[PDB]
Amino acid sequence: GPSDMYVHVGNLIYRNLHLFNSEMHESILVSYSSDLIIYRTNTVGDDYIPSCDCTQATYYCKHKNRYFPITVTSHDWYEIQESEYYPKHIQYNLLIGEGPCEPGDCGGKLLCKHGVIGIVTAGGDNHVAFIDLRHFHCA
Ligand SMILES: [Zn+2]
């Protein structure tokens, strides 16, 4: 659903590594540099990760409990200021754009007209960053 804070495609669940990492040894894929973890699940999800290059997007902002349109820009990597879960660091495979973000917002879905392309991973001042999931799926 629109409010689910993760992506569920077939039997794969995509989530923020910093909010998983507990059963990390049971996961199927981990990208430490991208705050991403993927694992097998027993139910089938209906999300779909496309392989487009869209920048016209929309995302779920948990603390506002609503969706916001957003224009995102790709970044192979980018500096990310310290937080409550990650200290100052460079993160990779990002999508950034302007919009609200507060602690607890990670996992929120970012979608383009084709499907889900990311999940919230970080928030700065007036900007929000997402993991570009298109980079972890075969076309
Ligand atoms: Zn698209």
From Swiss-Prot:
Signal peptide: none annotated. Zn(2+) 1 binds at C52, C54, C112, H114. It comes from the Viruses. It catalyses: Selective cleavage of Tyr-|-Gly bond in the picornavirus polyprotein. The active site is at H18 (for protease 2a activity), D35 (for protease 2a activity), C106 (for protease 2a activity). Homodimer. Cysteine protease that cleaves viral polyprotein and specific host proteins. It is responsible for the autocatalytic cleavage between the P1 and P2 regions, which is the first cleavage occurring in the polyprotein. Also cleaves the host translation initiation factor EIF4G1, in order to shut down the capped cellular mRNA translation. Inhibits the host nucleus-cytoplasm protein and RNA trafficking by cleaving host members of the nuclear pores. Counteracts stress granule formation probably by antagonizing its assembly or promoting its dissassembly. This is Protease 2A.
